[PDB]
């Protein structure tokens, strides 16, 4: 669901601009995933 | 009423019922005179200010170029500094310095001595200044072609009336070299030593 929100911030894109803003937006999106592994802890297939 | 210092150039304007003479000399002034009526000094007096704007410096003109193809409207003048200024006579206003030649990249190391234009093509005129004479087009501030460098200085260079391609320059080393662009642009067609004494000027018959 968290990844789905991230996907919406990408799926919504009309293929106009985005990269000049998405590149800046990529670092925070990557950071949320880092946080996600720690919160779950017992998450199965983490490497997968 | 005569302009101060020695006369630099004296030419006859052919576009008149009565012959008229235009004189450019070392006081930084340029005057047009009437042979029939000398009267009280020259009819037109112009000072060769350089750079316009608010900075005005008077520089003596060492060369005056006038041609029938160019006509009475355009007069070619070469200053002591090395820049070339064109003055256009107007009925409405007494004198206008319409074009400044080589103000930035065409400035000669030494004062321009001879300014001439090929009889075959009026648009192309070559000015002989210091070590190497240069050729400039009518609407370009910079010189179209710069030819080599020469021993001592070139006192005078004149285009051949019969052939546009070859122009002759006489050096101050007593050596006269003919430049022909029809065959080789890179080197002098031939070099001849007229005399040990320096050659002050060269004139070609028409």
């Amino acid at each position: 669901l968290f990844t789905l929100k991230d996907l919406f911030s990408k799926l919504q894109e009309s293929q106009p601009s985005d990269f000049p803003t998405l590149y800046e937006l990529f670092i925070p999106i990557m950071h949320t995933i880092l946080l996600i592994y720690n919160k779950s802890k017992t998450y199965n297939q983490p490497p997968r | 009423n005569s302009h101060y210092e020695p006369v630099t150039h004296f030419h006859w304007l052919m576009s008149k019922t009565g012959s008229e003479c235009v004189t450019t000399s070392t006081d930084g002034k340029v005057m047009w005179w009437d042979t029939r009526k000398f009267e009280a000094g020259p009819v037109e007096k112009l000072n060769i200010i350089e750079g316009l704007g608010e900075n005005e410096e008077i520089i003596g003109g060492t060369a005056l170029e006038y041609n029938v193809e160019a006509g009475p409207s355009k007069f070619l003048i070469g200053t002591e500094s090395g820049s070339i200024l064109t003055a256009n006579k107007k009925l409405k206003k007494p004198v206008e310095i319409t074009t400044r030649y080589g103000l930035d990249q065409g400035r000669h190391l030494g004062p321009v001595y001879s300014i001439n234009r090929s009889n075959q093509n009026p648009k192309y005129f070559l000015s002989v200044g210091d070590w190497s004479c240069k050729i400039w087009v009518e609407d370009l501030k910079t010189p179209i072609i710069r030819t080599k460098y020469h021993g001592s200085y070139l006192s005078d260079g004149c285009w051949s009336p019969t052939r546009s391609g070859a122009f002759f320059l006489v050096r101050r080393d007593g050596w006269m070299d003919v430049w022909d662009y029809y065959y080789r642009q890179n080197e002098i067609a031939f070099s001849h030593k007229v005399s040990d004494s320096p050659l002050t000027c060269i004139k070609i018959n028409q």
Partner: protein
Amino acid sequence: NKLEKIELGGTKGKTLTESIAQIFKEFEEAVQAFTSVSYDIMNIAEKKFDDDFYEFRSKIKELERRLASVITQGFDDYDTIYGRFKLLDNFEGLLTRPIIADELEKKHIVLLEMYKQDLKQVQSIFLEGKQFVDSMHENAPLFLNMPPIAGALTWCKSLRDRIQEPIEKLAQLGQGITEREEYKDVQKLYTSI
């Protein structure tokens, strides 16, 4: 595209331009092959485009090789530091990276050698001229008629202006031509004069 616009008009003319025109056309012909782009469209999955690129890579090298030859011929033809420098300015944005760049290094040493002759010629002319100016002898270096003491300063300025015109252009050259020992030796000669 920039190469087609270039109009050097130096030394030999038209034949050099015709060769340059053919090279520009050659590039257009390559674009027509690549320009048609049947299928392709930069597909990551399709490797057909990569094969076309290699064929296109050879065509650019052929275009660059011809440019190096024409550029080298033009530099020799001008025979003057000012004339050769003007050609470099026209092709300043036309250098094809490493292909053309290797030719440029050879051109830079030759240009430096030419300035050595001008510096020596000015110096030799200066020494002969200097003795006449001091004694105010006839057929002196000062142009036409001018104050003799005032004229010497003006004459010095004309010689000085000729010597320093190349230095501003020389500082323009990239790739550390300054590091070259030959370039440094010429600079020492210029400072002494």
